[PDB]
Design a protein around this nucleic acid. Structure first.
Length: 143
DNA sequence: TGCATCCGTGAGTCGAGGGTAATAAGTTGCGAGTGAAGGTTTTGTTTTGACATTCAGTGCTGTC
């Protein structure tokens, strides 16, 4: 029912990292590999399988732009199979070399796909301002 | 048959504090060896045909 898929993503957003998962591992959620896939297609508007590894790449794209690791820390970190295939699907998502992607300081959100909620989404508000050069005092350290 | 001379020997385990200081000619010629780093060469990270699967995709197919 509608209470299932919402609870599956509470697993899945927390288990987008730890299990090396395809839909066979996702088939342990009450029904078969196809029926859990059939139950997702209409209650969401997204198609689960190519989305998740792309969402796990979208989890890896912010890891490719704001985390301090090289290509092979994050080659198979997000449960992938190869690096050149990971480089390949990246071209169909961001149209940029990952060496070129962390070359430019500008980070545009083209291929990052948002995390899905079947329940109610807490929408933040926006207001566009233009700020001023203000002196302060503080120290720096890294992570 | 003595008489001189010339080498070669002399506690054990500790200890402290710490290596110091003369004087002197130059111009001129001129090859050889850090050196500016100029610049290539490699020895590795990235594009593109593939097509062989694979699971993802969507729906039907059959079922409690």
């Amino acid at each position: 029912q509608a209470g299932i898929i919402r609870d599956l993503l509470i697993w899945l957003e927390g288990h987008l990292d730890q299990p090396l998962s395809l839909d066979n591992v996702a088939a342990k959620a009450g029904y078969s590999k196809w029926h859990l896939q059939r139950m997702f297609k209409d209650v969401t508007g997204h198609a689960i399988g190519a989305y998740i590894r792309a969402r796990r790449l979208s989890k890896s794209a912010v890891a490719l732009r704001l985390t301090a690791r090289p290509i092979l820390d994050i080659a198979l970190q997000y449960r992938f199979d190869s690096q050149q295939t990971f480089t390949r699907a990246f071209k169909k998502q961001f149209a940029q070399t990952p060496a070129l992607y962390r070359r430019s300081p500008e980070w545009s959100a083209f291929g990052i796909r948002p995390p899905l909620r079947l329940g109610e989404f807490t929408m933040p508000e926006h207001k566009f301002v233009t700020l001023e050069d203000t002196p302060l005092i503080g120290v720096t350290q890294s992570y």
